[PDB]
Amino acid sequence: QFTERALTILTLAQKLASDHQHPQLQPIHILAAFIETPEDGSVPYLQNLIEKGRYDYDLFKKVVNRNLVRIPQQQPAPAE
Amino acid sequence: QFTERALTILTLAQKLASDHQHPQLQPIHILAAFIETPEDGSVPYLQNLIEKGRYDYDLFKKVVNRNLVRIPQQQPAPAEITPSYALGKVLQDAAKIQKQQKDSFIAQDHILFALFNDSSIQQIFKEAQVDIEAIKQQALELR
Numbered sequence: 001q002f003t004e005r006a007l008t009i010l011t012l013a014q015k016l017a018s019d020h021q022h023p024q025l026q027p028i029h030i031l032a033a034f035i036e037t038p039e040d041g042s043v044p045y046l047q048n049l050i051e052k053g054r055y056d057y058d059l060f061k062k063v064v065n066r067n068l069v070r071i072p073q074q075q076p077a078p079a080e
Numbered sequence: 081q082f083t084e085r086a087l088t089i090l091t092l093a094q095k096l097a098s099d100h101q102h103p104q105l106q107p108i109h110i111l112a113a114f115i116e117t118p119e120d121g122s123v124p125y126l127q128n129l130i131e132k133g134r135y136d137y138d139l140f141k142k143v144v145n146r147n148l149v150r151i152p153q154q155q156p157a158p159a160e161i162t163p164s165y166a167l168g169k170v171l172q173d174a175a176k177i178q179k180q181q182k183d184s185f186i187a188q189d190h191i192l193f194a195l196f197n198d199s200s201i202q203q204i205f206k207e208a209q210v211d212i213e214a215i216k217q218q219a220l221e222l223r
Binding site: 018019020021065068069073075076 | 133134135136139207208209211214
C-alpha cells in the first residue's frame, strides 16, 4: 500500500471528496490533498518537486481550487 | 446566559447590519458576523467549522458577501430593525444547544451551529450542505 505520508494525504483527498459533496474521487481532489497546508514541510506543495522545478506552486493550487468549486454536487451520501 | 464570545458574534451581526445599512436582521447578518474579520484565529472565518470540516471558507464568504451586496441600502434609522423571529429562533436554538451540550453559557459555536442548522444558501450561485457533524467535530476540538 501507501507510506504513512502518502496515506495521510490520500486519506485527506478522500475526506475532501466527501466534504465537497463530489460523486467521485478524482485527480482534482488528489491534487488538492497534495496542496495540503502552508507548512514548508509539505513536499507536495512548498518545498516540492515543482517550485524547485521552476514552476509556480500557487498557480497549481488556485487551478485545483477553481476545479473543486466547479465540480457538480451531490447531497453528501452519493459522494465518492 | 451567553459567553462574551457569543455576545460578540451576535453583536457584530447587529452592528454589521447597521454599518451596511440593512433593514431586518437575517441569517445573512449573523453569517456576516462570522466573516467580520480576516483574523484566522476567528473560528467563524478561517480556522472554521466549514474550512476544517467539509467546505472552502471562500464558498461561504462569497455566499455572505453576495447576500450583503444583494440586500439594498436603507436609511440608517432602520439599519438593524429587529432580530425578528429569525434571529430570535437562532438564539433560542443556541439555548436548545446549550441544553443538549450541557453548557452553562451560550458559546459562539452554538450560534455557529444554530445559525448553520437553520440556514441555507438563498441563491443558486453557491451551494453547501449544512454538515452538522463536521461543524460539531471542529467545534469540539477547539477551546
